[PDB]
């Protein structure tokens, strides 16, 4: 009926982590290659490459992520990076616009540019649908931060080797999220399952994106537009 | 093999 102290340390260090690695001013967006309206590809690669760096910064501040082997950390990041970027982008996704909004009109990304960044509606139809789903949950930032850490800490990812230890961590995070909803979220009494439902949605979007990324990365005139981080993280090594 | 990632993970 009440969160323990360690349960609320986990919450506190996770909210601090997110506040350090997400910037609501989006002022750093002016250092990317500008968007042109595959004319959107260079600005998207830059956007995603920057975001991957945030996710790594966030991951390093999750209690005990750092204590995994460097290999397990890489395996988790390589499989879960795109899911975490889809997750955190909810903070810039607007329901009135049905777009993401990270600046003036130039950092407003709409979906009609989908084919301009080398993707199809087969990815952006479910993604947008996911994004309004997640927005309707109207999450406290505690819950939003908790889902990213749980998403990152999935033992069922390709490459993981110590899927006991990281399942324990993921368990400790769900006990917090389960309890947070019970104690702190009014009308939070089926929100956990809905949230876990969103995790499985991600694995489906992940897949679609990984299939479409393969088509890009295999045409060198397109893969030359990506950054080295993107190529290493979404690569297959 | 993941030169950048290792670097970023300190
Ligand atoms: C990255 C984030 C912010 C939005 C996150 C988006 C916004 C999409 C706009 C695109 C709509 C257009 C302009 C085409 O019409 C996003 C997240 C996950 C997955 C995807 C699918 C496309 C990704 C392509 C990656 C490559 C090409 C390397 O395969 C997009 C903004 C802010 O929330 C910071 C956050 O981290």
Q: Could you tell me the two tokens for A95?
A: 């329901």
User: How many residues in chain B?
Assistant: 10
Chain-centroid distance, C-alpha A30: 21
Distance (Å) from the alpha carbon of A176 to chain B's nearest alpha carbon: 26
HEC states along chain A? CCCCHHHHHHHHHHHHHHHHHCCCCCHHHHHCCCCCCCCCHHHHHHHHHHHHHHHHHHHCCCCCCCCCCHHHHHHHHHHHHHHHHHHHHHHHEECCCCEEECCCCCCEECCCCHHHHCCCHHHHHHHHHHHHHHHHCCCCHHHHHHHHHHHHCCCCCCCCCCCCHHHHHHHHHHHHHHHHHHHHCCCCCCHHHHHHHHHHHHHHHHHHHHHHHHHHHCCHHHHCCCCHHHHHHCCCC
The data reach a resolution, in angstroms, of: 2.6
Q: Which of A55, A56, A80, A81 to mutate to test the interface with B (most CBs of B within 10 A)?
A: A56
From CA A12, how far away is CA A142, in angstroms rounded?
9
Q: Could you tell me the two tokens for A192?
A: 């956990």
Which residues contact ligand 1 via a Cβ below 6 A? A 40, 44-45, 47-48, 51, 82, 85-86, 88-89, 91-92, 100, 102, 109-114, 117, 119, 127, 209, 213, 226, 230
List Cβ neighbours of A106 (8 Å cut-off, separation of 6 or more): A34, A35
User: Residues A58, A148: contact at Cβ < 8 Å?
Assistant: yes
Which residues from B are below 8 Å from A228, CB to CB?
A: 4
Q: Atom 30, ligand 1: which residue's CA is nearest?
A: A86
Distance A51 CA to ligand 1 centre (A): 9
List Cβ neighbours of A120 (8 Å cut-off, separation of 6 or more): A114, A212
User: Residues A82, A206: contact at Cβ < 8 Å?
Assistant: yes
Residue with tokens 């920057």: A50
Q: Work out whether the CA dihedral A64, A65, A69, A72 comes out positive or negative.
A: positive
Torsion of CA A109, A112, A116, A118, to 10 degrees: 100
Distance A188 CA to ligand 1 centre (A): 30
A226 touches chain B (CB under 8 A): no
Q: What is the layout of strands, in order, in the sheet containing A99-101?
A: A93-94, A99-101, A108-109
């Amino acid at each position: 009926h009440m969160l323990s102290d360690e349960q609320m340390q986990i919450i506190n260090s996770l909210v601090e982590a997110h506040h350090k690695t997400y910037d609501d001013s989006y002022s750093d967006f002016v250092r990317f290659r500008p968007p042109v309206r595959l004319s959107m590809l260079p600005h998207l690669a830059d956007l995603v490459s920057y975001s991957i760096q945030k996710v790594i910064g966030f991951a390093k501040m999750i209690p005990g992520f750092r204590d995994l082997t460097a290999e397990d950390q890489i395996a988790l990041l390589k499989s879960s990076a795109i899911e975490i970027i889809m997750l955190r982008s909810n903070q810039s996704f607007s329901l009135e616009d049905m777009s993401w909004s990270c600046g003036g009109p130039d950092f407003k990304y709409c979906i009609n540019d989908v084919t301009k960044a080398g993707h199809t509606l087969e990815l952006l139809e479910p993604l947008v649908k996911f994004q309004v789903g997640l927005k309707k949950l109207k999450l406290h930032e505690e819950e939003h931060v908790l889902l990213m850490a749980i998403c990152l800490l999935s033992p069922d990812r390709p490459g993981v080797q110590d899927h006991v230890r990281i399942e324990a961590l993921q368990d400790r995070l769900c006990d917090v999220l389960q309890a947070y909803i019970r104690i702190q979220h009014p009308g939070g009494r089926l929100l956990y399952a809905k949230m876990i439902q969103k995790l499985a949605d991600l694995r489906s979007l992940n897949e679609e994106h990984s299939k479409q990324y393969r088509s890009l990365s295999f045409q060198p005139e397109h893969s030359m537009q990506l950054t080295p981080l993107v190529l290493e993280v979404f690569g297959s090594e | 093999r993941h030169k950048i990632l290792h670097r970023l993970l300190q």
